[PDB]
Amino acid sequence: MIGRKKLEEHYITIAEAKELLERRHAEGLAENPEEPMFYEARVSLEHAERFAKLKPEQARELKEKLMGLFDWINERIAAKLVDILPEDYLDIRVIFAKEEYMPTPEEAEEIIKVIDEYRP
Amino acid sequence: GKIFTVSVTVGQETTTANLIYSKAKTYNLPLYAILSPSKVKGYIFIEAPNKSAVEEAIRGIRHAKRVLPGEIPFSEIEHFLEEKPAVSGFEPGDIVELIAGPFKGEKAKVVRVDESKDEIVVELVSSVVPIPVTVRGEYVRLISKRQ
Amino acid sequence: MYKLLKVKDVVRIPPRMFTMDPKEAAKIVLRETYEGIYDRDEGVVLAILDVEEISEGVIVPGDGATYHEAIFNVLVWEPRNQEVVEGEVVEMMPYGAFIRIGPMDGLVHISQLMDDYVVFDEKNRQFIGKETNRVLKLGDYVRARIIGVSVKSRVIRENKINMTMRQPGLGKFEWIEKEKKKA
Amino acid sequence: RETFVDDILKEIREIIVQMVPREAGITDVEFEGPELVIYVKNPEAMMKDGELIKNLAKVLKKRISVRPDPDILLPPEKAEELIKQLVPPEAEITNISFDPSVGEVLIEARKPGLVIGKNGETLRLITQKVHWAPRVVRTPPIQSQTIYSIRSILQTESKDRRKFLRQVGRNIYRKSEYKSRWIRITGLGGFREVGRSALLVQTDESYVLVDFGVNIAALKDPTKAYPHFDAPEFRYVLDEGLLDAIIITHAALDHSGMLPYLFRYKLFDGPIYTTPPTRDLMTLLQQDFIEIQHMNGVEPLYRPKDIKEVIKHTITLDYGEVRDIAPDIRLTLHNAGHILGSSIVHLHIGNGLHNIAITGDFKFIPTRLFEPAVSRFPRLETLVMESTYGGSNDYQMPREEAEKRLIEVIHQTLKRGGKVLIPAMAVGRAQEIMMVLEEYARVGGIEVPIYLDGMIWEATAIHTAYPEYLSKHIREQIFHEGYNPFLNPIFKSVANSRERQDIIDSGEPAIIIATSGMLVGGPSVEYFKQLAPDPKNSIIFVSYQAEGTLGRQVQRGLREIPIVGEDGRTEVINVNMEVHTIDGFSGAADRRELMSYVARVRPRPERIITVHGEAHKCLDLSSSIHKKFGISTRAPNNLDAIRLK
Amino acid sequence: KERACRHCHYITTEDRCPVCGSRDLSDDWFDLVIVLDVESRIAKKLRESIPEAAKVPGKYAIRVR
DNA sequence: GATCATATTGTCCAGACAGT
DNA sequence: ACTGTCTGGACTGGTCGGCGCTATGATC
RNA sequence: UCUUAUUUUUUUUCUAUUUUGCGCCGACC
Ligand SMILES: [Zn+2]
Ligand SMILES: [Zn+2]
C-alpha cells in the first residue's frame, strides 16, 4: 500500500511511462551523483526506449480514441491494445482469450483499423 | 473383597508392593490381594475387605502416600489381568510416540504391525528420507488414530 | 502493467531539509523512501514524478522532524495475472529463460517454451528446436502472458514471475509473422 | 548371532603365555577396536627388545598394545616429571594427559619423532621407567579449533570411547579367520552419478559400508540428495544392526555428508575407520554444511551432537596399516593424493579369497601438496575407480604452465598496485595455491602479505598438524629441514570484519584467498563487492563455476551484476577488475591420469567398476579401458549388486 | 538375579521353580501381581486367563517376554 | 565407588449472603 | 425489608549496609 | 466344448562472513 490512501488510479501506457522515466533521468542528471536512478528504473527506461513504438501524444490520442469508441473496455484494455498494436485476429484472440469478452470479428476488425492509423 | 487404590512414588510401585507383601506375611494382615500393573505409574491396587485394612497395611511405609476413599469396581481393573499383547489395537497409518529405546522421545508413523513377534515398524516423521525401524510394541503410545 | 497513481501521504522532513523548498524536500524523502520497493496492491514502485499539493507541517512529540500531508504522482509497474506483455530475452540457463519486460524479469520454462523438446546449446547459450528447427538467441523480441506472480517479499529481485508461452500466437516476432503468413 | 570371541581370546592368551616370558606377568588380554591389548605387571621384562613385540604381532596378526596393569601406576604429578626428564628437550612437549581407567598417557608434542623414538625404543623406555603406556600426538604449529575440540571430546568421554572400542573388538572377533561363501558389491549411490556415494561390501558373515555421502547439487530432491535407503540389502543391514564398519575414502560432502545422519536416528552404532586428517576435515566440512543449511532456512540434516557422536565412533588408521575390521575382511588405507587424508581403501576378504581397491577421488600425477596415488598392492582382483573426468575429451592442462600463468597473473596484478582475490574451496585447490604462492615468494618474487579468510586458516592448521600425509618434498622440508612452508610470515589470518575492512581499505598490494568459489557466501562476496569497482584488482578462479551463482555471472563477463543489497533495494556491482580463469588446479584425476593409473597398477585387476561420475563419462571410460587393456569393465547404476566371488 | 517362569508366570529368586516344575526361566518380565487369597477375584481372573497360575499365594504375571 | 527420576497438595473496611 | 456473618483486600516511599538459602534415597 | 485388464522423453551448486528470587535484621530521610 503506497501512502495513506489512493486518490486516482490510471493505467498508463508505455510511451508516457518512457516520457516520465526520461524526465526522471533528466532530474538525476541534474542531481550531482552520476547515477540518476537505481537498477530497476534504469532497466525500465531502457526497455521502454527499446519498445517505444509510439510517441507519447500519439499514444494518448490512441488511448482516448479507444476509450471514447466503446464502453465495456477500460484504461487497462486500451493501454494493452496500444502497447501490442495488433494487426490481425491472432494477437487480438491471444489477448482476449482469458478476458471477460471474446470480441466478434467485426469489432475486432474495427479495433484493427483504428489501431493501424498513423502506425509506423 | 473391595478394590482400593494406594498412591506410591512413581517408578517404584513394585518395591512398595513387595514391602506390603512382606509386611502382610510377617504381621498377619487380612489382605486379600495386591496388584501393581507396569502401565499404571505411581499407584497400586489392593483387594481387601475394607479400607481400614488397606490404610493399616500401608501405614509405616514412607513411600505410600494415601489411600483413595472410593472403591474401584472390578470391571475397571478386569482388563488389566487379561492376556493381551501390547501390539494389539495398533493399526498402520496412525501416529505414535516412542516411549523408550534408542529413539526415545520421537514421533513416528506405523507402517507394519504384527502380534506374533511382539514388534512394530515405524517410520520417523522428522526423517527427510523414509527409513523404517522396528521397536517393541509396548514402547509406543497412540497419539492420534488415523488410517 | 504500467500505472500512474495519485497518492496522498504523510511525509517526514528532517530539520536538515528545512532550508529547502517543502515540495522538493517532500519529493526527496518520498524518492528515498518508496522508490525501488515492491507493494502488494501497487507493484514495482518505479518513480515519483512530482508533488502537486502540500499542507502545513505538524510537529509530533519526541521528534524534531516535520510531518506534511502531501499529494504526489507515482509511476509504478504492476504485473497482472493472465496479462500479455512483450519483452526481450536477456538471460538463458538450462531450466528456463529470463526475459526483461520492465522492472522485473520474467521466467519462461524450457519445457513450456514451445510444443517441442527444445534443446539448450551450452556453447553459445542458444535454444534449438528438434523438429521446428527454430533458433532462439539473445536480444530476440518475444511476447508472452503471465500466469504466476510471487508477492511473498517486498524486494523486487526476490519476487518471481512465471509466464506462459506454449499457447499459439506467442513467441518470437519472426515466429508470429510466420504464423500470420499461414493464416 | 553366535560369538566365539571367548575361545579366540583364550587361545591368544595360551599362545602368549607359551611365547611371552612368564616373569612378565600377563594379567588380562582383551580386544580394543581392531587391536589386541595386553596388560602386564612387569613391563621391564616384556619389552627388553622390540624383537619380541614384533614376533608377537607377526604370529598373532594383531596390533599389540602392551599396557601396565592398573594395579601399579605412578602418580601423574610425578609421571609428568619423569616423562619430561626422559624425553629430550628438543621435542617441545606441549601437553601431557593421563587416563587411569585403562593405563594410558597422551603426549601432545611439537616433535613426535623424538618422543616416539628412532625405532620406537623411546616409548618402550618411557613406559618401562614410568609404567604408563604412551600415545604421542603432534602439536600443530598453527592452532586448530576443530582438532582441539576432537581431542577434548575424546578425552572427556574416555569411558564411552573405551566401552565402544571393547564392544567393537568383541564384534570383530566373533569368529576366527572365515572364508566367505560369496562377496558382493552394491552401490547405494554415486553409481553413474556424481555425489551421494555409498558402497556396500556384503558377505555371508559381515557387511561393510564405504564412503557414505550426500548430494549437494540435488539437495532439493530427497530421492537424489541421499543414498538409497529403500535398498532391501541396506534395510536388512541397518535393521538387524549387521553393519560391521564404515570406511570413508576422503573427507568431502559426497563421501562423508550423510555419516552423522545415521547417528542422528541411531541407525548405526559401530566404528568409522578413517585417517585422522580425514576425520578432522570431515567434521569441519560437516559443521560447515550444517551451518549453511541452517542459514539457508531449510531444516538441518543433523545436529552437531551427531557429529560429536561420529567423532566418538571414529577409529584412526594410518597409511599402510592393516587392521581386522570384520571376521573375513581386513582393511588398509593407501595414499590417494586427492586431498589431505584422502585414502584409497584396500579390502582383503578371506585368506587370499578376494581383494577390492576403491580409489575414490584420487590424483595420479605427483602434485606439490601430496604424493602420487599408490598403484601397487600386495594383491588386487577388483578395482573400483572414479570417473569424474573419464570423458574422451576431458584433458586437464598440466600443472606447470597453469601455475606459471597464475604466478604471472598475480605478478601483473601486484605490479599496478591492485589486489588479487582468489576464490577457492575450503580444502584441496586452496592449499595448493598457498604452496605455489609460498614457492614463488621464497625466492623473493613477491613480498606482499597473503590473507587467508573463511575457514582456510582451519584447513591450513589441519594440514600442519599432519605433515606425514603430505608430499615427499614438504615432508623433507618440514622434518629434515627447519623450514615449514605453511609457516611463512606472508600467510596472515583475519580476526573479524574490522581486519577485513582494513585489508580492503589498505592501498598496498595484497593477495586475498577467499572461501567460496561461487561467491555465494563467506567473505568472498564481501571482498568481491568491495574490490570490484577498482580496475587495478583482479580475480582468479581455480574451480568450476555453477550456473545461477555470482561466480559464474562474474566469470561470464558481466560488467554490472544486480544483487539484493541492504534496505531491500537492488544495488549493482560495477565489475571493472580483471577476471581470470585458471582451472588447472583441480584435484581430480584426468582421463590421461586414469589411463596411466590403469596401465601402471600392480597387479592388474580382474575387473574394473567405473563409478563416481556422469553416466556417459562412466560408460566412455569403461569402454575405453576395455578396448585398450582388455580388462572387464562395468559401469552399473544404483541398486546394482555385482557378485565378485 | 531376578527371573520369572514362562509356564506358570511365577516370580522366583532361585533357579528352581517350586510351583510348576519346569526348566524355562525369563529374565524380562513386567506386571507383578501379588496373590494372598485363593478365592480373591483377581486370582480367579488370573486362573481363567492362565490355567496354571495363581494356584498358591505369591507373585505372578500376565505376560512374559 | 558414580548416576538418576522424583521431589505433598492482625485490624479494619467493604461486598455478598442466609436468617427472621 | 433489616441484621449479623462470611469472605476478600490493603497495610507511606526511597536509600545505605549485611546474612543466608535455593537435594535426595535407590541402582549396578 | 469357453467368459470380463492394461503399456513409454523437459529444474541448476559436492558448499559459505555485567547473578536473580525469597525471607530476615538493622539504620537513615
Ligand atoms: Zn568424491
Ligand atoms: Zn513355573
From Swiss-Prot, chain B:
Disruption phenotype: Essential, it cannot be deleted. Keywords: Chromosome, Transcription, Transcription regulation, Transcription termination. GO terms for cellular component: chromosome. Its main location: cytoplasm. It comes from the Archaea. It is found in: Chromosome. Pfam families: KOW, Spt5-NGN. CDD domains: KOW_NusG (cd06091), NGN_Arch (cd09887). GO terms for biological process: DNA-templated transcription termination; regulation of DNA-templated transcription elongation; regulation of transcription by RNA polymerase II; transcription elongation-coupled chromatin remodeling. Gene3D superfamilies: 2.30.30.30, NusG, N-terminal domain. One of its GO terms (molecular function) is translation elongation factor activity. Belongs to the archaeal Spt5 family. Heterodimer composed of Spt4 and Spt5. Interacts with RNA polymerase (RNAP). The complex interacts with FttA. The Stp4-Spt5 complex stimulates transcription elongation on both naked DNA and histone-bound DNA (chromatin), facilitating transcription through the histone barrier. Neither protein functions alone. The complex also stimulates the transcription termination activity of FttA, neither protein alone nor the KOW domain of Spt5 stimulates FttA-dependent termination. This is Transcription elongation factor Spt5. It comes from Thermococcus kodakarensis (strain ATCC BAA-918 / JCM 12380 / KOD1).
Curated annotation (Swiss-Prot), chain D:
Transcription termination is stimulated by the Spt4-Spt5 complex. Dipicolinic acid inhibits FttA-mediated termination in vitro and inhibits growth in vivo. One of its GO terms (molecular function) is RNA endonuclease activity. GO terms for biological process: DNA-templated transcription termination. Residues 587-645 are annotated as: Metallo-beta-lactamase C-terminus. Residues 182-392 are annotated as: Metallo-beta-lactamase N-terminus. It comes from the Archaea. Zn(2+) 1 binds at H250, A252, H338, D361. SMART domains: Beta-Casp (SM01027), KH (SM00322), Lactamase_B (SM00849). Its EC number is 3.1.-.-. Disruption phenotype: Essential, it cannot be deleted, and enzymatically impaired strains of FttA could not be generated. In depletion experiments transcript 3'-UTRs become longer, suggesting transcription termination is altered in vivo. Binds 2 Zn(2+) ions, which are required for nuclease activity. Its cofactor is Zn(2+). Terminates transcription on the whole genome. Termination is linked to FttA-mediated RNA cleavage and does not require NTP hydrolysis. Cleaves endonucleolytically at the RNA exit channel of RNA polymerase (RNAP); the 5'-3' exonuclease activity of this protein degrades the nascent RNA released from RNAP. Facilitates transcription termination; addition of this factor to stalled transcription elongation complexes (TEC) promotes nascent transcript cleavage and releases RNA polymerase (RNAP) from DNA in vitro. Transcription termination competes with productive transcription elongation. Termination is stimulated by C-rich transcripts and inhibited by G-rich transcripts; the Spt4-Spt5 complex enhances termination on C-less transcripts. Yields an approximately 100 nucleotide RNA, consistent with endonucleolytic cleavage at the RNA exit channel of RNAP. There are about 2100 +/- 500 molecules of FttA per cell; RNAP is estimated to be present at about 3000 molecules per cell. This is Transcription termination factor FttA. The gene is fttA.
Swiss-Prot record, chain E:
Keywords: Chromosome, DNA-directed RNA polymerase, Metal-binding, Transcription, Transcription regulation, Zinc. SMART domains: Spt4 (SM01389). Zn(2+) binds at C5, C8, C17, C20. It comes from the Archaea. The keyword Transferase does not apply. Disruption phenotype: Essential, it cannot be deleted. PANTHER family: TRANSCRIPTION ELONGATION FACTOR SPT4. This is Transcription elongation factor Spt4.
